[PDB]
Design a protein around this ligand. Sequence first.
Ligand code: UZK
Ligand code: SAM
Ligand code: ZN
Ligand code: ZN
Ligand code: ZN
Length: 427
Amino acid sequence: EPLKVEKFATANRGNGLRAVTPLRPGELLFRSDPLAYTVCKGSRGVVCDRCLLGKEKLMRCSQCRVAKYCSAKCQKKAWPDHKRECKCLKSCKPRYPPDSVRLLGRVVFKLMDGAPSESEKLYSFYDLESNINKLTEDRKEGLRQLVMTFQHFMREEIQDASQLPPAFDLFEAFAKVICNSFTICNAEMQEVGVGLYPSISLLNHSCDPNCSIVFNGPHLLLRAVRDIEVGEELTICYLDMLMTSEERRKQLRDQYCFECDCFRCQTQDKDADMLTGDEQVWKEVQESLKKIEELKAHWKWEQVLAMCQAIISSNSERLPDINIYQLKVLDCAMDACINLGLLEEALFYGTRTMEPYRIFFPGSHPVRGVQVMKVGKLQLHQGMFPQAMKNLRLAFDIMRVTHGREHSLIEDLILLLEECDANIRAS
Ligand SMILES: C[C@H]1CC(=O)Nc2cc(C(=O)NCCC3CC3)ccc2N1C(=O)N1C[C@H]2C[C@H]2C1
Ligand SMILES: C[S@@+](CC[C@H](N)C(=O)[O-])C[C@H]1O[C@@H](n2cnc3c(N)ncnc32)[C@H](O)[C@@H]1O
Ligand SMILES: [Zn+2]
Ligand SMILES: [Zn+2]
Ligand SMILES: [Zn+2]
């Protein structure tokens, strides 16, 4: 087309994006590569720095030995955007910067040395919201420490303002990174990276959004997940869906500097179901999930499983599977079992998540699509063809909207549907 989306000034949430034309569910609205991105702390040396895909053997950069790649192609193609950070990562070994500092280093090299980035077509890094006039004194102290970390990390390549863009202010730049960073998940919906996508950063938040984002490696696809009218604002949910209105309030304040008065937040929509079961038990499970989630972020599946089994099959009191902390534990146990080849056990945990996921991911949401695909795949390979086909079709109905033909995972699902339908054809 011309574009289906445009920048505008909203009445009370800054700049946003609105529909130029009526939009239908599954319609591709925009796509972008990042201005800058990096692998997250826990996936470092587990996934390729460039394509964010995993592999038993990664090859490191010989100069810094921090960057690791899946292939010669990826190591070579990454070199231009790695060249300057390489000198810094080496210089500062064995100190590894926070992900926000590595990210901002890549922003500064891209803006100093690169051609104008296609990622900034609708909105640039310069234009991003910083919320500087709402930052608490505590936040400002933490930004000051990031600035001093960046100055330390980058000293080999950046000694003064001459090597930053004109009137670039590192404090403001970090403030922009906090409230504009995208979390990059792999095809299995595991966090692997963080990136800046300035055009896409126009999207304001809704706890019941009309669009979704998905990632195919570092590439971001924005799709409609509802009917949208001409002039209607486009929204995504910035947060994990498995959060109460109080948890959403805390993160939207702390990270985004705004108060949400949507219907869901006004009515604590779903919070009572999410916290069913005995509070003493779900409080302990919430506490244990800090460690389980840290182990998962480091791809430590045997330790994830052990901790999850101690909860799911506890000798002591148990939670209903609609309890969000129980549900996260089931999720982590399912993924651990898939990665360990414990496929009967995986399917047990995955099937228990299906009804909670139907409730907590209403309409078309990519996380529920992928979860249903995983369960259907487990059923297909265990010879449960009618159960598998039902789940793979449901996954397709969701993923055709959330992922679309432009996402390679849809090709993988199409192959599973074909295999399943050959089996029912022969039956
Ligand atoms: C839906 C899925 C889509 C993905 O791949 N990434 C993802 C990104 C965000 C996000 O970036 N929110 C902030 C937007 C910025 C201010 C514009 C939020 C959620 C994300 N997803 C996700 O399920 N999460 C993120 C992480 C694994 C946990 C849960
Ligand atoms: C990723 S940016 C979105 C674009 C931003 N409004 C701009 O002007 O650049 C995130 C910031 O937008 C604002 N924002 C996003 N969703 C909002 C909402 N539902 N209500 C109020 N402000 C919101 C907050 O300032 C938040 O930190
Ligand atoms: Zn690669
Ligand atoms: Zn290097
Ligand atoms: Zn809300």
